[PDB]
Short mmCIF file of C-alpha atoms and ligand atoms in Angstrom, two decimals:
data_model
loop_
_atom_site.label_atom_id
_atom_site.label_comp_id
_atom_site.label_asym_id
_atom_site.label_seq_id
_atom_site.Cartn_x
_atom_site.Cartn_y
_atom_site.Cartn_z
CA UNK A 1 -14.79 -13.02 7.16
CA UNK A 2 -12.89 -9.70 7.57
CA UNK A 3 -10.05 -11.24 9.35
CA UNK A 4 -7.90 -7.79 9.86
CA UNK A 5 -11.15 -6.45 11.19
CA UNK A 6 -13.24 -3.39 10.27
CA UNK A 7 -12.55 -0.17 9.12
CA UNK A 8 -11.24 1.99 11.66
CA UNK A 9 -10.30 5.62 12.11
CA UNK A 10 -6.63 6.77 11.14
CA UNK A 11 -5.79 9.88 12.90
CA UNK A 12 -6.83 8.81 16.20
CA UNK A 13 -5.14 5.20 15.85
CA UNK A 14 -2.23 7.41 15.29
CA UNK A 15 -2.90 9.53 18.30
CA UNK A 16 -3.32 6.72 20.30
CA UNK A 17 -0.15 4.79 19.51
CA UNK A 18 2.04 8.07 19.37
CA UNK A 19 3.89 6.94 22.82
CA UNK A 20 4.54 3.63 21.36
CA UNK A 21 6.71 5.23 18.33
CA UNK A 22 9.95 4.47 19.46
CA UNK A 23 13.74 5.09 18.24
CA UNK A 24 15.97 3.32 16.63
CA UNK A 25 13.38 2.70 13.70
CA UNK A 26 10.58 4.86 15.27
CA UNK A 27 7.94 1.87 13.67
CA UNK A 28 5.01 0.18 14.39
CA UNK A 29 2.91 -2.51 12.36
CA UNK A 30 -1.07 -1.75 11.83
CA UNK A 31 -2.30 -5.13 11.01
CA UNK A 32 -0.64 -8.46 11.87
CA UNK A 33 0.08 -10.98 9.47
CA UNK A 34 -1.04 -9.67 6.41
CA UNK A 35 0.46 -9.97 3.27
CA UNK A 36 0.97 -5.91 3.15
CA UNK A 37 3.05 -4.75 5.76
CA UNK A 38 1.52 -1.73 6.84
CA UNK A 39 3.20 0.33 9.26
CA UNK A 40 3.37 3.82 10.92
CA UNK A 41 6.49 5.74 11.13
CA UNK A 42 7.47 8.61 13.73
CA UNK A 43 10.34 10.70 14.71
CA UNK A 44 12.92 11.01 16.27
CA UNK A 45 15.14 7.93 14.50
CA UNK A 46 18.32 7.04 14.61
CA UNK A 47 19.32 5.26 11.43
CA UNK A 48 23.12 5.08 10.05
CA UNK A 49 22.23 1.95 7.57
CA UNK A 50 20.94 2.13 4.36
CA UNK A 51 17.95 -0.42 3.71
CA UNK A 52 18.17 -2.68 0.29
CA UNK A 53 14.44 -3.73 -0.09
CA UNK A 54 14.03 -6.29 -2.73
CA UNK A 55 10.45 -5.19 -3.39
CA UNK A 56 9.08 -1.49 -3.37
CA UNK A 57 7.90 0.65 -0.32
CA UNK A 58 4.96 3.61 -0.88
CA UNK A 59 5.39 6.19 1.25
CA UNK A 60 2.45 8.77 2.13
CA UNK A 61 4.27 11.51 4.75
CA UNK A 62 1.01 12.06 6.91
CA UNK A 63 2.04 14.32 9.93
CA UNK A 64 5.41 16.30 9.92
CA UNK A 65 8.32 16.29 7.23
CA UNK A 66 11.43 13.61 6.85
CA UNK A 67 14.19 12.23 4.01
CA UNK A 68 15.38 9.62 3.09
CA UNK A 69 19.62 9.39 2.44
CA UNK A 70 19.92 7.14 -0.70
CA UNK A 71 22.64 6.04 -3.32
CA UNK A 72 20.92 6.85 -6.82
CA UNK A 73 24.21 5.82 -9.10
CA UNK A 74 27.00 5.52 -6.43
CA UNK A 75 25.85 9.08 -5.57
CA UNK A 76 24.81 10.27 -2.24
CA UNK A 77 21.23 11.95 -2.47
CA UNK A 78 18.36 13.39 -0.82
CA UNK A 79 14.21 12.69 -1.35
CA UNK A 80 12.74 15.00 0.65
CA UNK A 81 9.36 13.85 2.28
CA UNK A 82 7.47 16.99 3.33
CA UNK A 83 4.72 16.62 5.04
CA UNK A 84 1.51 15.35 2.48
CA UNK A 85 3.93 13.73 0.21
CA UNK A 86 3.60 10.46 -0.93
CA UNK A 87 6.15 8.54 -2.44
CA UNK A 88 7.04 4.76 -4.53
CA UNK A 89 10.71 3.72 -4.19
CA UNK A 90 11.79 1.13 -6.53
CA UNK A 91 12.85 -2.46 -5.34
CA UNK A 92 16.89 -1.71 -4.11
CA UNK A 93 17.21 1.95 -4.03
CA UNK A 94 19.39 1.77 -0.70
CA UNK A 95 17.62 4.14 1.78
CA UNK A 96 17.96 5.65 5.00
CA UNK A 97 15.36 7.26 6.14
CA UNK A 98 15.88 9.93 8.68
CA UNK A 99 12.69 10.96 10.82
CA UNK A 100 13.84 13.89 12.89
CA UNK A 101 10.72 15.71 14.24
CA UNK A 102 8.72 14.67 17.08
CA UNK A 103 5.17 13.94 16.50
CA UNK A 104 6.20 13.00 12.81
CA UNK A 105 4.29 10.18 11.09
CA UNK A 106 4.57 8.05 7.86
CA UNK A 107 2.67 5.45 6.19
CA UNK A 108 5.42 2.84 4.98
CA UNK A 109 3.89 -0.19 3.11
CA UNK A 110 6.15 -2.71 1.79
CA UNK A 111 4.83 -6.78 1.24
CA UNK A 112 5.88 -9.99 3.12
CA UNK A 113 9.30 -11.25 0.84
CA UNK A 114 8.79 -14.87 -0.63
CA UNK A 115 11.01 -17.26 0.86
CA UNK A 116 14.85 -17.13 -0.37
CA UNK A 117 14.13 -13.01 -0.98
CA UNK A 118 16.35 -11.45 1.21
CA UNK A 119 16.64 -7.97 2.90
CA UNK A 120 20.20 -6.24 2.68
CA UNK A 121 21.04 -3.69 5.32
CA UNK A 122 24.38 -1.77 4.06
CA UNK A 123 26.88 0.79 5.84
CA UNK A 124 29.05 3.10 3.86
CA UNK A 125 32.00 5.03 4.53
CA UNK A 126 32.03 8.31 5.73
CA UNK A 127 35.60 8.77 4.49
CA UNK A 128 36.02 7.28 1.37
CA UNK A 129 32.29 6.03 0.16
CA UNK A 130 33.17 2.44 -0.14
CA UNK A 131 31.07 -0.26 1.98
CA UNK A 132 32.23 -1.05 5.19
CA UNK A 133 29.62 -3.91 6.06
CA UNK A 134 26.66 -5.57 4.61
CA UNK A 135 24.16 -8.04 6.25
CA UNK A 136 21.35 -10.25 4.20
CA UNK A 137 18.35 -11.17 6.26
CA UNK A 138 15.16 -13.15 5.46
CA UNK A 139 13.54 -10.26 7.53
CA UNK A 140 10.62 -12.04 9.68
CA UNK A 141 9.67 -8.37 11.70
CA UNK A 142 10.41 -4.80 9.92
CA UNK A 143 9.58 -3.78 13.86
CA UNK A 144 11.47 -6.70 15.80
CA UNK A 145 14.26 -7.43 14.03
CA UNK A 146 15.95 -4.44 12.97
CA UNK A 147 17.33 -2.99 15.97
CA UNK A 148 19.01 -5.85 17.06
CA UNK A 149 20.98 -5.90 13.82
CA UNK A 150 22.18 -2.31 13.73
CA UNK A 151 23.50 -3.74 17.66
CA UNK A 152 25.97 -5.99 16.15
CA UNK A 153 27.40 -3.59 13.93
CA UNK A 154 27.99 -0.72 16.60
CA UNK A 155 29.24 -3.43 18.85
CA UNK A 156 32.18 -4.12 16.77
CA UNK A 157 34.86 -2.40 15.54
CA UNK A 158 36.18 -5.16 12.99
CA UNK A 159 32.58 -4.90 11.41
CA UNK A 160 33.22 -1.37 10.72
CA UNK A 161 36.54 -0.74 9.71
CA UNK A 162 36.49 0.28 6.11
CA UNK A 163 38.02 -2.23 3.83
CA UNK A 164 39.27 0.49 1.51
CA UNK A 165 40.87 3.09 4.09
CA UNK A 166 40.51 1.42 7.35
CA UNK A 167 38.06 4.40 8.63
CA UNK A 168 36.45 2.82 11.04
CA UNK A 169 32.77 4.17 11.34
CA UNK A 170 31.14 6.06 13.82
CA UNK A 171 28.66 3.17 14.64
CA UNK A 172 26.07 4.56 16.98
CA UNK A 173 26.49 7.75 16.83
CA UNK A 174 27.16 8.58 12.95
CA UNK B 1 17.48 5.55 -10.43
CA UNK B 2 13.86 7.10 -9.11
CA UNK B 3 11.77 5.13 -11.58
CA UNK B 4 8.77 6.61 -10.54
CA UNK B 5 10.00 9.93 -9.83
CA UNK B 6 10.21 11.68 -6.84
CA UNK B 7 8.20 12.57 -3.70
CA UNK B 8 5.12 14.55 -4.88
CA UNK B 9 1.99 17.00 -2.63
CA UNK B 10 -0.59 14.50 -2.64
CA UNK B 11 -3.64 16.77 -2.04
CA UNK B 12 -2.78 18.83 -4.81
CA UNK B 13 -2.72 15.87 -6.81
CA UNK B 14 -5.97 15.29 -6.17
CA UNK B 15 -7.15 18.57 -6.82
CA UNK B 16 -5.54 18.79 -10.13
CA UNK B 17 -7.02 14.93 -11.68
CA UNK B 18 -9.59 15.47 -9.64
CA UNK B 19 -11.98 16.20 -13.57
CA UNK B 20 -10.23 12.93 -14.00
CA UNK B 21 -11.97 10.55 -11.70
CA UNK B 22 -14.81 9.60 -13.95
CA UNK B 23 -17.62 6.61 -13.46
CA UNK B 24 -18.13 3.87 -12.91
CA UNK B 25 -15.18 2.99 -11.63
CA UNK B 26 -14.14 6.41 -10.31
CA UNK B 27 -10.29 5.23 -10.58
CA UNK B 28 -7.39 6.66 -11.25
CA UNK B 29 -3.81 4.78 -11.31
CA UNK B 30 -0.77 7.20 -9.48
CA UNK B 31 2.09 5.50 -10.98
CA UNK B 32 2.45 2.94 -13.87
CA UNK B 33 3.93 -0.01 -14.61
CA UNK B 34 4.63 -0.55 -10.55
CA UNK B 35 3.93 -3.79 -8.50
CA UNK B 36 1.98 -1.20 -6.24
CA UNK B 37 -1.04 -0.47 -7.87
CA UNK B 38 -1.78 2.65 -6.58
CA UNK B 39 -4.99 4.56 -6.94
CA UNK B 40 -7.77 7.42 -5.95
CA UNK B 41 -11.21 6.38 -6.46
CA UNK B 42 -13.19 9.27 -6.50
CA UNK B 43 -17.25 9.50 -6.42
CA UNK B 44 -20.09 9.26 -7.58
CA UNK B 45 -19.25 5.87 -9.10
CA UNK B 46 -21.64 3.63 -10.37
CA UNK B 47 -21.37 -0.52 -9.04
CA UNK B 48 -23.65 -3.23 -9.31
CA UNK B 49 -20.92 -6.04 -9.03
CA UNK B 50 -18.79 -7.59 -6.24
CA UNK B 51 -15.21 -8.14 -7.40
CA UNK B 52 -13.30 -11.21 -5.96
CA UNK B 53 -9.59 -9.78 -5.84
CA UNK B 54 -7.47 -12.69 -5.24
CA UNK B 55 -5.03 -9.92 -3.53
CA UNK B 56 -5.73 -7.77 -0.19
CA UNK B 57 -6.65 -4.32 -0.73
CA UNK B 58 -6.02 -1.91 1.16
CA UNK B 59 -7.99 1.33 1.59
CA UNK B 60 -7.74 4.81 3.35
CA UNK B 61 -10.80 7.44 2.98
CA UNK B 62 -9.23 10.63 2.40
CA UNK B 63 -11.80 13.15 2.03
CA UNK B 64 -15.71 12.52 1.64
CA UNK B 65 -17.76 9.13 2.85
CA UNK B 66 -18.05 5.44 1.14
CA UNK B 67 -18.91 2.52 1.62
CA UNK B 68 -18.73 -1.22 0.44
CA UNK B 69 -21.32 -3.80 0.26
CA UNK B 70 -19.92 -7.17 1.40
CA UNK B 71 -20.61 -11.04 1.24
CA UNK B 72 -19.54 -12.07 4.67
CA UNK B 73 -21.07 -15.53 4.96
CA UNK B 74 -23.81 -15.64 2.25
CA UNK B 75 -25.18 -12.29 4.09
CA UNK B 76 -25.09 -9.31 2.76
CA UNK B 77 -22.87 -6.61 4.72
CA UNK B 78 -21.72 -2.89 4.90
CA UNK B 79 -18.35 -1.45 5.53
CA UNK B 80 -18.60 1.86 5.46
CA UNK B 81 -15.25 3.92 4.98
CA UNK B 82 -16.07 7.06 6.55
CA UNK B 83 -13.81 10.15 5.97
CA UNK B 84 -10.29 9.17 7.86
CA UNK B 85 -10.85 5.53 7.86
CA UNK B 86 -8.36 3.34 6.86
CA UNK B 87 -9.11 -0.87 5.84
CA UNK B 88 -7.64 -3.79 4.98
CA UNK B 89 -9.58 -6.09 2.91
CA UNK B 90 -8.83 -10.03 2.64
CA UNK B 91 -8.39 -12.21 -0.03
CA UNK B 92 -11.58 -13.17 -1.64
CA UNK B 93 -13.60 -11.18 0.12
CA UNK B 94 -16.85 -10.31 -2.55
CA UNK B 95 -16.93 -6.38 -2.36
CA UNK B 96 -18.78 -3.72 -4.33
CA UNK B 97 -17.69 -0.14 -3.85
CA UNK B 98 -20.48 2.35 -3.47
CA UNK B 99 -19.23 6.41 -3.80
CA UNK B 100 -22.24 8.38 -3.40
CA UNK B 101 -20.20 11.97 -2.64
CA UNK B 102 -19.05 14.18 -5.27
CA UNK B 103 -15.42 15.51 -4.80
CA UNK B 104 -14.70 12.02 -2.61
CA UNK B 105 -11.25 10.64 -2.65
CA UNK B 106 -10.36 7.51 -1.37
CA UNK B 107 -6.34 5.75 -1.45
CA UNK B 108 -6.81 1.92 -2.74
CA UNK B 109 -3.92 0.17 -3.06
CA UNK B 110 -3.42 -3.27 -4.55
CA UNK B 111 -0.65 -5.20 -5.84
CA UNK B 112 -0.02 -6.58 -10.04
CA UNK B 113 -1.36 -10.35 -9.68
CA UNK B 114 0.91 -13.38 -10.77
CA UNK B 115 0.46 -15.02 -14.49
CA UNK B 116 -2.67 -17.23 -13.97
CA UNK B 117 -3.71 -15.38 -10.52
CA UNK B 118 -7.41 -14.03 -11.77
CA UNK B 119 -9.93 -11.40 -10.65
CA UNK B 120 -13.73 -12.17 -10.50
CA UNK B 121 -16.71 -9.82 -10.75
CA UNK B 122 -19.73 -11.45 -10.00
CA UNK B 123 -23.21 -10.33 -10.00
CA UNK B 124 -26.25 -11.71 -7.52
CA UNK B 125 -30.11 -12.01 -7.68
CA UNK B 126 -31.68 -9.45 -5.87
CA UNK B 127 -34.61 -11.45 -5.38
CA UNK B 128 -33.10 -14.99 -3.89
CA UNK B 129 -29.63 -13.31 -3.44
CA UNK B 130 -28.12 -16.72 -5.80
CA UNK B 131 -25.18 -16.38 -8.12
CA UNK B 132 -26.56 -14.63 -11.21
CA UNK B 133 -23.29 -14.24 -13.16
CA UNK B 134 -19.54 -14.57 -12.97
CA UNK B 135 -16.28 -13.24 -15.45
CA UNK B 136 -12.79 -14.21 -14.31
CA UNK B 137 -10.26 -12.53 -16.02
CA UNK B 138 -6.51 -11.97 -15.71
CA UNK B 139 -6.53 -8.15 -15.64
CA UNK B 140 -4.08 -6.16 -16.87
CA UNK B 141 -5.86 -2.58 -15.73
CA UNK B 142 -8.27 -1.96 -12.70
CA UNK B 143 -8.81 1.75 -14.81
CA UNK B 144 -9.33 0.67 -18.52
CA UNK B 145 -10.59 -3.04 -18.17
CA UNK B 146 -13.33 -2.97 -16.19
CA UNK B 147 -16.24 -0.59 -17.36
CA UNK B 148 -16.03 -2.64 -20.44
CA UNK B 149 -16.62 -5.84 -18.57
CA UNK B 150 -19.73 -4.53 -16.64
CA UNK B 151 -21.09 -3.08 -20.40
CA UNK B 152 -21.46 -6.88 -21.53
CA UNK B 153 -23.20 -8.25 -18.62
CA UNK B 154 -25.68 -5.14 -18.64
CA UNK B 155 -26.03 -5.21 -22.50
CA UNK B 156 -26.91 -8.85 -22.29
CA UNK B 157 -30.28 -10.56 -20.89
CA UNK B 158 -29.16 -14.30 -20.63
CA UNK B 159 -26.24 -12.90 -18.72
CA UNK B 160 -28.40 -11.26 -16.21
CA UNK B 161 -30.79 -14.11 -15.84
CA UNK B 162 -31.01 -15.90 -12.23
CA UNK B 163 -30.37 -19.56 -12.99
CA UNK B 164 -32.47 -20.13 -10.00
CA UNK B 165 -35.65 -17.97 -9.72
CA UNK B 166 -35.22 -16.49 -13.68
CA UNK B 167 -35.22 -13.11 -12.13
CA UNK B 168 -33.83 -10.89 -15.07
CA UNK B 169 -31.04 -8.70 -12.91
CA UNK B 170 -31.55 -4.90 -13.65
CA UNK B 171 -28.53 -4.03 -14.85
CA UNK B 172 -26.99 -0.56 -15.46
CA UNK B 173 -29.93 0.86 -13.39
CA UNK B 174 -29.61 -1.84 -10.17
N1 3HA C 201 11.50 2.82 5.15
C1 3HA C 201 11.58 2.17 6.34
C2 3HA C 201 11.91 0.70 6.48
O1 3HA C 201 12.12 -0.10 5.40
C3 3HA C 201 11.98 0.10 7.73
C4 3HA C 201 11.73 0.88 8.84
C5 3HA C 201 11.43 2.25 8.80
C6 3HA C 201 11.34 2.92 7.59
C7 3HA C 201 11.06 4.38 7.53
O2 3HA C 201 10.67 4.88 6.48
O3 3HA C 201 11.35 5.04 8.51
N1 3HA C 202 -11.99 -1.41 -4.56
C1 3HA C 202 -11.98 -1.05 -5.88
C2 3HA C 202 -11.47 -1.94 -6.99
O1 3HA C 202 -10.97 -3.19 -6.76
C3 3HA C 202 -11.49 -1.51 -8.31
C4 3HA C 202 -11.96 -0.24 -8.58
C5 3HA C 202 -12.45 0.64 -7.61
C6 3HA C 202 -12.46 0.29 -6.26
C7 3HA C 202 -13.02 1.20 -5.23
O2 3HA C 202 -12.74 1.01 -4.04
O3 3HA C 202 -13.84 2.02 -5.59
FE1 FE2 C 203 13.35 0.51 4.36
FE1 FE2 C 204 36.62 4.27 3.67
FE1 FE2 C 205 -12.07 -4.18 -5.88
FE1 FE2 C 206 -32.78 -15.21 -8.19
#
């Protein structure tokens, strides 16, 4: 049968989740254990980490206009996502998407990782460039597991002292 | 690097390839060569077969009305996608897409299948509803394999032929 149910209307799902939205990520998941994850995205974030996705993520910018921070050789860049623009990153472009308007939304789908394919969630230093800390996860929840993650990094000073200059990053408010 | 380029308008996408989305499929692939296969299906498309996608689709109606007939059980259903609608179809599910409305656009989104994962497109009687035909095939384009596909089973009587009441399936006019 149709196990993730019928077809349902978009903007007013969106309307009617709006309050649920919430920072650091700013996520939430559409259908439940599905093979595509298929989220919504809204504003305001707070992200400092860069994501390393071993698969690819399509974006489609629905409501309101964002970016996304990446590394594209070793170089800091820029893809803008103005509103209506959609969007395939490749598997391991590091990203950090930055959602600062209120009453944003994105549609983010990305597929469930075999088993032994592991997430990478990477901070760089302001200072000198060079990585201060990476953590591999065999992600089970792009909603509820990330936050808790970013937590142990701002928590700890040792995990963000730059190995290259000793800069020790802003953490939690970068 | 961006291997498939950067963010892009996606109504004005449309609008431009819009004298692209021909019957009758109605497809048209975004990005090539991806793990994503993205596309706009626009209307009026002509389908007489249910494809078994070994995948889940997923769909969002973004301008004009659709709909797709279903095997549920053994019954024949209707999802209809109406303008805003988004859906997520399962695994397996038997589904043939009907586009009635010129200038429709609708996101579907499925994923490259594994090395020995195959698509089916069956047809059924229309008088006792049995099995009339089925192709499996590993596809390598949901654009450029399939109206050739559908032109043997129409071009062909046996093909068409209910192997349980004999009932001679229309074809390219059903
Ligand atoms: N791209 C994202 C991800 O991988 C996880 C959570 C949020 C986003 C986003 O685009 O905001
Ligand atoms: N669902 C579809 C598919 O699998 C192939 C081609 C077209 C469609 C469609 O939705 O029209
Ligand atoms: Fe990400
Ligand atoms: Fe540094
Ligand atoms: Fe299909
Ligand atoms: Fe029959």
């Amino acid at each position: 049968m149709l196990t993730y149910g019928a077809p349902f209307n978009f903007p007013r799902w969106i309307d009617e989740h709006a309050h649920l939205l919430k920072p650091p990520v700013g996520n939430r998941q559409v259908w439940q254990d599905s093979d595509f994850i298929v989220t919504v995205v809204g504003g305001p974030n707070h992200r400092t980490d860069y994501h390393d996705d071993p698969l690819e993520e399509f974006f489609y910018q629905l409501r309101g206009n964002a970016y996304l921070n990446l590394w594209v050789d070793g170089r800091r860049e820029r893809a803008d996502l103005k509103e209506g623009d959609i969007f395939l990153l490749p598997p391991h472009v590091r990203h950090s998407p930055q959602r600062p308007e209120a009453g944003s939304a994105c549609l983010v789908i990305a597929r469930q990782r075999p088993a032994g394919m592991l997430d990478g969630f990477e901070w760089y230093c302001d200072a000198c460039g060079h990585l201060v800390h990476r953590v591999e996860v065999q992600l089970k929840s792009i909603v509820t597991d990330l936050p808790p993650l970013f937590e142990s990094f701002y928590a700890s000073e040792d995990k963000r002292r730059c190995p290259h200059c000793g800069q020790v990053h802003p953490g939690r408010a970068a």
